Amino acid sequence: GKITVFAACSLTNAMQDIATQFKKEKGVDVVSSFASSSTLARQIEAGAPADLFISADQKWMDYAVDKKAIDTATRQTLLGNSLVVVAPKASVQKDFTIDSKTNWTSLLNGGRLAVGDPEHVPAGIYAKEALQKLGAWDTLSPKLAPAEDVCGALALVERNEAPLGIVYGSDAVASKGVKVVATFPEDSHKKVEYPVAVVEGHNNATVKAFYDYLKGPQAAEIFKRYGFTIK
């Protein structure tokens, strides 16, 4: 009795604790592979035998679905999250409020904005989308420090290679080394939503019981503990 979950990077800590518990209360081992949702959707398209896939956006779930790789009837939106600007924990930067008059250059002071790569990384695509609506994207696009996932973007900031980054609400929570300094207004981007689905061919009673457990009160308590919103 062994389950494989492919989950967005941002779910690392939450998923590891759900797994350790599930094995404790159910005796089934859940082993996770974490990465950009783009990379994971691509692996699944390419035949990777994941049992479940949780994406950090709808876009990469839609992708896996339109490639016939998903048991589509099972797709549900599981989580919500906020999009935030982090600075390193030692930074003197204070909280501020984001709007179309936020002077991103002055805050950056010759530094880069750490982001998931907006070409594919959901955190980056949300960020691009907020920055465009805010009217700040053409100023910012040549000034990015892109990473291969939202964990890479966080780490640029932890290490002080970038003064600011855009990550999720939840990412600042699992990180000793950065502090949230602003939250994007919800009206600046598409809702950050995390769909889950059973991978095509893997809809069996063992996998179903874990899929049901991700909406269980034990998983809920952990998700919330890590700063996710429950759907």
From Swiss-Prot:
One of its GO terms (cellular component) is membrane. Part of the ABC transporter complex ModABC involved in the transport of molybdenum into the cell. Binds molybdate with high affinity in vitro and with a similar affinity in vivo. Binds tungstate with high affinity in vitro. Binds unnatural anion perrhenate with high affinity in vitro. Does not bind sulfate, phosphate, arsenate, selenate, chlorate, metavanadate, nitrate, perchlorate, permanganate or carbonate. It holds the Pfam family SBP_bac_11. Disruption phenotype: Cells are unable to transport molybdate unless high levels of it is supplied in the culture medium. This is Molybdate-binding protein ModA. Changing residue 192 to A/Y/W: No change in affinity for perrhenate. The complex is composed of two ATP-binding proteins (ModC), two transmembrane proteins (ModB) and a solute-binding protein (ModA). Changing residue 10 to C: Loss of binding to perrhenate. Slightly reduced chromate removal from a buffered solution. Molybdate binds at residues 10, 37, 123, 150, 168. Keywords: Chromate resistance, Metal-binding, Molybdenum, Periplasm, Signal, Transport, Tungsten. Belongs to the bacterial solute-binding protein ModA family. Gene3D superfamilies: Periplasmic binding protein-like II (3.40.190.10). It comes from the Bacteria. Changing residue 10 to E: Slightly reduced chromate removal from a buffered solution. The keyword Zinc does not apply. It is found in: Periplasm. It comes from Escherichia coli (strain K12). InterPro entries: ModA, ModA/WtpA. Induction: Expression is up-regulated by molybdate limitation. Repressed by molybdate-bound ModE. One of its GO terms (molecular function) is molybdenum ion binding. Its main location: periplasm.
